[PDB]
Design a protein around this ligand. Sequence first.
Ligand SMILES: Nc1nc2c(ncn2[C@@H]2O[C@H](COP(=O)(O)OP(=O)(O)OP(=O)(O)O)[C@@H](O)[C@H]2O)c(=O)[nH]1
Ligand SMILES: NCCc1ccc(O)c(O)c1
Lengths: 56, 341, 277, 226
Amino acid sequence: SIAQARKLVEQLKMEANIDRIKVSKAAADLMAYCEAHAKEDPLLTPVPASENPFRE
Amino acid sequence: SGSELDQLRQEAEQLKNQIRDARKACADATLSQITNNIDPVGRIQMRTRRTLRGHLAKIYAMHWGTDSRLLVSASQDGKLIIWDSYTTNKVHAIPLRSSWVMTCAYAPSGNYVACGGLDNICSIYNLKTREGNVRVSRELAGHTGYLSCCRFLDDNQIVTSSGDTTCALWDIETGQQTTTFTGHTGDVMSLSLAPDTRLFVSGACDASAKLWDVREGMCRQTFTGHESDINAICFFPNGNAFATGSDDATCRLFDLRADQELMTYSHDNIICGITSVSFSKSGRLLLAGYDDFNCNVWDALKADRAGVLAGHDNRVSCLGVTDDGMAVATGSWDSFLKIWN
Amino acid sequence: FSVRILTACFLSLLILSTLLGNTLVCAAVIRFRHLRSKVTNFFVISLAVSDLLVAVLVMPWKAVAEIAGFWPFGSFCNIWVAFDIMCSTASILNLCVISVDRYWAISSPFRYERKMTPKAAFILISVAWTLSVLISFIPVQLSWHKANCDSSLSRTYAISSSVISFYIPVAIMIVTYTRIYRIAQKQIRRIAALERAAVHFKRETKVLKTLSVIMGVFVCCWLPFFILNCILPFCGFCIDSNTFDVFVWFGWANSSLNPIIYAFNADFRKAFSTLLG
Amino acid sequence: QREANKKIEKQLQKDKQVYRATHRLLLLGADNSGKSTIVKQMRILHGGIFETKFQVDKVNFHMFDVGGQRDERRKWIQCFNDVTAIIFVVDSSDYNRLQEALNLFKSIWNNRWLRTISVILFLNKQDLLAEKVLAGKSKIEDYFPEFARYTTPEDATPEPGEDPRVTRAKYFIRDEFLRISTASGDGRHYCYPHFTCAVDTENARRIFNDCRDIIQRMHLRQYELL
Ligand SMILES: Nc1nc2c(ncn2[C@@H]2O[C@H](COP(=O)(O)OP(=O)(O)OP(=O)(O)O)[C@@H](O)[C@H]2O)c(=O)[nH]1
Ligand SMILES: NCCc1ccc(O)c(O)c1
């Protein structure tokens, strides 16, 4: 168990020293990517059956 | 004290509390507070447009093509069927050696198919073969556990997930594990490649998800929070977020750059486990497959449920959205696939 | 008066309960395809349809004629009595089938999963319904049962339609359920051997409870009417029209109870719960 | 068009019914228990390899042995929640890994995903057990002192010429596994013990009989009879 403890500490030290951003910015980018493509998602806004290959 | 093992346990817990502090530093708001002013997507009522039959047992995997037209399906009858979703016709029906297949992938060129299972072997078949019938082309051996998922990078790179709690990047021709990713305690169940092939995440039975750097072979982030084993995972179409579903009847959305959980999707009336997850084309909609024969549609921004998909007669084992967002497919334990839009 | 209006309201409640239970069964089947998925469920649907016909067609007119005392639809009632003979006979018939079904699934489980294809299920349902319609309509429209609406059939028709419609199904059902009892007693004894060995009556009482409930409700509900239907035209010791009418109502009462005794599996319970909420 | 639809739906209906009619049996048990030898023998005498497909009396079976080699074989086993029965094989002649086998059996019998899967217990390698019993060199009481106070059951049906020591040994192992199997209870699943050796040939009639019993008891508890 001596090797796995050195490996657990070194992995946690590598994962610990990351720089994190604010949740506000993560949500603002998600909202921007959402509304930037919202009008093009057929599953959200149903597209008329004419351009639907399974309805025409 | 003095024994470096107990001191490593102490520095470990110290690091977990430094991580909790580094998480609360960026934990300034909640997703609900940010998205309280958005409008709900409204009622979304998709209907079954096709039903693809032929399979003799419960289906376990499906994968759209890049053309959003072809897809591969795996049943426990020893078959790997390729479907033309427009006409519901089968283009090929490849019998497999081991009938307990658990995953299948589709090369972005449409040139190769993959599959694997309890044989701990990933078999690649060239669909663009030049004579007779599609047959085995390559076969990647080396895992001491069952292959649960595999995905192509290109026609010669594929990443696999196995029951030896490790992931590996392979050179299909040479059959060598070009890169090994270790660190999970339990069985790694699912992987999802980033839209730029550069990264991928994996969910294991140690109630943890891990983000792996493809080119460097190191684990970048480890996320926890689920009380059970994580069974499914998928990237947000943007590439900076992903969702997980677990046996504890809960879905959780994590962000990579913030290094903590962002949102939890659950209802006190949903008690069955969860088998598959997938984002919409814009990532605004999150689809999750439950054992209760239903598909729950969550609003990936407000955590509110926006729709249900009651169209299968048995447990939904898998699902997948087209890459163009034109339709969604669902594979279930009724030996049927259903397209919804 | 008080008795007349009370009989009226109770009978209307009986009819409404029959309709609700059986329409709930047919709807719970049609709405949920995972209940319609198996094959044994087909026969239960047949039973529900038989009881729904009893309800909508036969019962209310007899209740009105019992209240008012006179048959108002007139030339109709020939048909009515035919319908009566038919529906109250597809019901008993259907029970027989369901019982035999269960037997095939317990005395030879392997042969069952192989041989019972939905084609054989439809053949059995067809046998039930065609025996009913044949033996019912044909002698009415041909006026063979005849030598306010006169329901007195005839001495030979009584015995004939009775032997068929009741005494063959009750024989088959008693034989079948007693065979199932022998088998269940065997399996309990085996499990008891193993469990007593490991650790080194109640479940038998449970078997008795369920078999007695099933077979005993059917018999104690239909049998008196049919021993009367046997003796009365013969004895034209004897009884009166009112008693014959209440024992008739017992017969149609089985038609009310059938859903609760044949369609309360746990999944059936949850389907009802998710329909009504 | 119409006749293509007719030929397809009826061939696919017969194949769907056939797969529905094949009884999958999962083989589980420690290694050094002759599991692979039993599957190899079935492949030989009726028709080793990871898989086996064999028919008894027009009844199809599919026997599978999983070689994933781990402890919580959840996903590798919870994908096989619909098998008719689990054949648990145990090397009765390995006196010290028997507690390991018992613990694994306890974890299987109380598994959350097998609450309804009945298990057929094969106590394999009885000939080696008789050899060890006649040798009298490694006694079970040294590992399980309870065997000292154990009494041969009065319901035992020994084969002609069986040493009471051997009878007591094999029925002791039987009751050691039955003590685990009878706790859980709940009537959702049962254990069917069998004394077997690798050369026994009726080891198909036993699996047939007991799959039939499992189906009988499922049909009984379905109609609330049992
Ligand atoms: N004398 C005797 N030997 C047996 C019997 N059954 C199995 N063996 C031996 O025990 C060994 C262990 O069996 P294996 O073939 O390894 O099967 P297993 O150990 O249960 O599982 P694997 O190791 O994966 O094959 C075999 O090599 C057989 O030679 C038996 O009934 N009698
Ligand atoms: N409700 C009684 C209808 C009926 C049905 C069958 C018979 O044999 C019979 O004599 C009378």
